[PDB]
Design a protein around this ligand. Structure first.
Ligand code: MG
Ligand code: MG
Ligand code: MG
Ligand code: MG
Ligand code: MG
Lengths: 157, 204, 82, 47, 129, 80, 123
RNA sequence: UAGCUAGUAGGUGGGGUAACGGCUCACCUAGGCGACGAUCCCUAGCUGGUCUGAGAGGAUGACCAGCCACACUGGAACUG
RNA sequence: ACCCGCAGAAGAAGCACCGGCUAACUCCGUGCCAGCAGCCACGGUAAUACGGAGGGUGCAAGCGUUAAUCGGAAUUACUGGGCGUAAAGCGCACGCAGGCGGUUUGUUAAGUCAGAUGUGAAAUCCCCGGGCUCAACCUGGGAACUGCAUCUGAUACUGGC
């Protein structure tokens, strides 16, 4: 039921006199593929354990975002740290145009068609966070109506 | 314009029943489709995302028997066309005369169908075409010439077609050896194993 | 001088003509004043082949425009068809 | 096949001169495990 | 210098939205008033009122629906440094329609959508979401 | 109706000859800023009636000299 | 970033300079070997590298790497230049495309022979 | 590359151009151009376009289309 | 051109690559030597990186290569960067040219926008079909040709009075 995927893995070192501990950072992301997305960032001495940790993290602290049928609702900019991301709604069946890491990120989310680009410098974790921020910002056609206290059709045209 | 040599190697590399042979005999009994090509068969490394897309693309190319440049051209054409891009790409891929013939049941394999098309046997609209990449329009009647009606391989192909899956967008006749194109090929009729989106993403 | 002349504006083995009004001395396939139609030398029996705007041609000759022999012949056949 | 004598116009001893130029350098092993050993990315990389 | 009044107003509005202010007071203009009216019509704000004879002050009442600010992003595209003029068909659609653009239309200042409906272009003042 | 153009006098030192500048509003193709752009022209004037720094209405006409190709129709501002 | 600034002096684009100045925007070039020699590479490495100072078509005395093992290259011989740079040697921005002109291909190489001018054998 | 230029810029009259004209001569005036880059130098066919690019743009301008220029270099006029 | 008859796979496949990027990995000399390489440097006696052999991968009558140009470079950022510490605030003020300009009314229509006219040679690029046996190609229509100009208007703004 839940789509789950590893994005990035780092060899991260806690240097000590007794010898530098070579530890593994794991970055995963889960989601049902219908709306909700949740990223998880787990680090451990081992790799599979780390990945499991990451998965667990992803499992809770999950962001619920509504989707325009099977695509993005509105041209949204998701910003985090140094990695600024522009994300655009794309036409029917054109595919997830996003990245090597970001494509995977959006795959779990459930967006079929997207036109997305990260700018400047892009760390995987950072980029995922940016995406998530963008998603959070992203609002449904009825939410905006509610905010306005208005009709959806009227808002549309 | 075409690959020549070991053809089930391709699908072994993929790891899926790709229908790259006629298949009266089972695909697992004749070749070890479960295993990768060569020495490093039992080895199954963790495959990259780009890598998987590439593999999918290759699978698609294998399916039809289309080399890279031609495939690129097809993709471009699809992009040019209105609507679902992947679907459009699928449509003309199918629309290839040889592939249409294969679907009908006049060549038991896609390569075989291509060969038949080449060897002056397939006669669309009363004109025999050497070219396999002829895009077939709806409401077109393709006939097999009386010179080609002597062959038993065609009969075998027909039998295989009868045995296997039946397409809805095409009508095939056994004793008459006539085909009819009803509508443009769609994603609904074809199997869900194809990942057109991935290929599209790759071609950027 | 002003001439109603046809130019071979087609490919190798697949020829195509276009009946234009142009200066005589200048290049055949280069520049023109006004195009009035076209001509298919293959001339398929199923669907047309030859197409011109006769009124414009008539107007041009009224104000003194020469007609090429082939063009004249084509015009004559069009008239016959009519 | 020439070697471009870093020393140049060699006047006295050729052997000694050569031994005192890049061709006969002090070459040091980049060993693993110990001191001057750590590599961020290996020969084949992390999987 | 007090160069752009509209921009200043927009900034004030943004600040209010951020700091959860119920009412924002600012120096007033006729065009400003029109803009405010347009905004009200669109549904972003509660009510606007201008008061002052020698020194006119526009008061704007803001909405915070379900514990969050309604006017999320509000930014000028046309500027005193660089003015952007758009044609009828060249008019933008801000956030796929779910969001609007303030346009200086020759038949009264209004929404981009409204301008499109009319068949008239002009200067695209601000982008409101 | 024929085209008319308006500008201000740069100098009127030369005998029966005026230099007028049109401060045209140019839209920049790259950036989008509207620049007041100088269009410095040599204009023919009758009787040398105008003065230095004066707004005049001019029309497009035949070449009179090497650079001259305008004649004024009416003077819009006279006061200095 | 100010538009007015841009207006009166525009964006001075980063001047694209060629990595291979002696080539003069040409795929290959012909040169007679003024000197044929071998010299040590950069400090991460330790070897002896096949190189040639060549007097060029346009009179441009440049050093060029000689790819492959075992060469017929001698002083006063006409060679052809690839514009491929080698980070091991300073000044070396050129390969010598083997199998061309006076020079011949590398002996007994079987795979990746298209770069070293070795012929198709009967095996 | 910060000053450029005396037929130089404009007038009046003459000579001429197919025709307007410093296009040219006589004479007077002291101008005109320019940091919205005149001037000087280096490179360059320009353009319709072509490639690239999401788009904007960036590069480039073989072919095909048009204009110009040049015919050994330099000129120069006769003819039509 | 194209079409009819004949035999037979007969005469038409190979280069580039397989360390990671970058799809694909093992064994034999070799040993910081020879060599590799677009970059991070492989090579120091077990090389998934050299060189060969076997097994691949991807192209395909090619394929590399260097070159050239654009992209990715949001590495000149109009779109779409910045500037405390990373490169980047004139040492600081006054100040003309220019750039930017508060509010109310009238009002020009300059600017701009709208609309209409002329129009933007063609071919192509682009859309629908058409002819080739389909493609490349030729082209028919249509669209575009983002313009430039005239006139008729619009008065919300920008500037001018
Ligand atoms: Mg030149
Ligand atoms: Mg791999
Ligand atoms: Mg850039
Ligand atoms: Mg600093
Ligand atoms: Mg510092």
């Amino acid at each position: 039921e839940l789509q789950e995927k590893l994005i990035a893995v780092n060899r991260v070192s806690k240097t000590v006199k007794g010898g530098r501990i070579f530890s593994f950072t794991a970055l995963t992301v889960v989601g049902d593929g219908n709306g909700r997305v949740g990223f998880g960032y787990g680090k451990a001495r081992e790799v599979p354990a780390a990945i499991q940790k990451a998965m667990e993290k992803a499992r809770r602290n999950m962001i619920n975002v509504a989707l325009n049928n099977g695509t993005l609702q509105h041209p949204v900019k998701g910003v985090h740290t140094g990695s600024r991301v522009f994300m655009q709604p794309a036409s029917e069946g054109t595919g997830i145009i996003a990245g090597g890491a970001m494509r995977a990120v959006l795959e779990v989310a459930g967006v079929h068609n997207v036109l997305a680009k990260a700018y400047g410098s892009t760390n995987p974790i950072n980029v995922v966070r940016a995406t998530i921020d963008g998603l959070e910002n992203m609002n449904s056609p009825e939410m905006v109506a509610a905010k306005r206290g208005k009709s959806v059709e009227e808002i549309l045209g | 314009a075409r690959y020549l040599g070991p053809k089930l190697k391709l699908s072994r590399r993929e790891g899926t029943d790709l229908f790259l042979k006629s298949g009266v005999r089972a695909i697992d009994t004749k070749c070890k489709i479960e295993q990768a090509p060569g020495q490093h068969g039992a080895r199954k490394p963790r495959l990259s995302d780009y890598g998987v897309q590439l593999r999918e693309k290759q699978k698609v190319r294998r399916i039809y028997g289309v080399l890279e440049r031609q495939f690129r051209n097809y993709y471009k054409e699809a992009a040019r066309l209105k609507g679902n891009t992947g679907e459009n790409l699928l449509a003309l891929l199918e629309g290839r005369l040889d592939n249409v013939v294969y679907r009908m049941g006049f060549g038991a394999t896609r390569a075989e169908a291509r060969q038949l098309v080449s060897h002056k046997a397939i006669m669309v609209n009363g004109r025999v075409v050497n070219i396999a990449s002829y895009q077939v329009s709806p409401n077109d009647v393709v006939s097999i010439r009386e010179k080609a009606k002597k062959q038993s391989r065609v009969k075998a192909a027909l039998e295989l077609a009868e045995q296997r899956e039946k397409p809805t967008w095409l009508e095939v006749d056994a004793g008459k050896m006539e085909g009819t194109f009803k509508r443009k090929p769609e994603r609904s009729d074809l199997s869900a194993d194809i990942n057109e989106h991935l290929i599209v993403e790759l071609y950027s | 001088m002003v001439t109603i002349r046809l130019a071979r504006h087609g490919a190798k083995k697949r020829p195509f003509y276009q009946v234009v009004v142009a200066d005589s001395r200048n290049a055949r396939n280069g520049r023109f004043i006004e195009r009035v139609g076209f001509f298919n030398p293959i001339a398929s029996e199923k669907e047309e082949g030859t197409r011109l705007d006769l009124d414009r041609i008539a107007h041009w000759v009224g104000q003194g425009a020469t007609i090429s022999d082939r063009v004249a012949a084509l015009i004559k056949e069009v008239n016959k068809a009519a | 096949s020439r070697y471009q004598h870093t020393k140049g116009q060699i006047k006295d001893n050729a052997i000694e001169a050569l031994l005192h130029d890049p061709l006969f350098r002090q070459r040091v092993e980049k060993n693993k495990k110990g001191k001057g050993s750590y590599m961020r990315k290996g020969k084949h990389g992390n999987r | 210098s007090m160069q752009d009044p509209i921009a200043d107003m927009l900034t004030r509005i943004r600040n209010g939205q951020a700091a959860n202010k119920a009412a924002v007071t600012m120096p007033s203009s006729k065009l400003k008033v029109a803009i405010a009216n347009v905004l009200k019509e669109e549904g972003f704000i509660e009510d606007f009122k201008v008061e002052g004879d020698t020194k006119p002050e526009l008061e704007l009442t803001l909405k915070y629906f379900q514990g969050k600010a309604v006017v999320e992003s509000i930014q000028r595209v046309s500027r005193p440094g660089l003015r952007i003029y758009k044609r009828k068909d060249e008019l933008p659609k801000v956030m796929a329609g779910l969001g609007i653009a303030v346009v200086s239309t020759s038949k009264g200042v209004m929404t981009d959508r409204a301008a499109r409906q009319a068949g008239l272009g002009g200067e695209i003042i601000c982008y409101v979401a | 109706k024929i085209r008319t153009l308006q500008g201000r006098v740069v100098s009127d030192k030369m005998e029966k000859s005026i230099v007028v500048a049109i401060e045209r509003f140019v839209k920049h193709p790259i950036y989008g800023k509207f620049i007041k752009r100088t269009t410095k022209l040599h204009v023919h004037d009758e009787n040398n009636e105008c003065g230095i720094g004066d707004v005049v209405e001019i029309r497009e006409c035949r070449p009179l000299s090497k650079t001259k190709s305008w004649t004024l129709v009416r003077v819009v501002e006279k006061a200095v | 970033a100010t538009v007015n600034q841009l207006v009166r002096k525009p964006r001075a684009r980063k001047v694209a300079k060629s990595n291979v100045p002696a080539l003069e925007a040409c795929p290959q070039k012909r040169g007679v070997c003024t000197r044929v020699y071998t010299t040590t590479p950069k400090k991460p490495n330790s070897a002896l590298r096949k190189v040639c100072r060549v007097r060029l078509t346009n009179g441009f005395e440049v050093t060029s790497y000689i790819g492959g093992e075992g060469h017929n290259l001698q002083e006063h011989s006409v060679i052809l230049i690839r514009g491929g740079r080698v980070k091991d040697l300073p000044g070396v921005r050129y390969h010598t495309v083997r199998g061309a002109l006076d020079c011949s291909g590398v002996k007994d190489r079987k795979q990746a022979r298209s770069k070293y001018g070795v012929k198709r054998p009967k095996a």
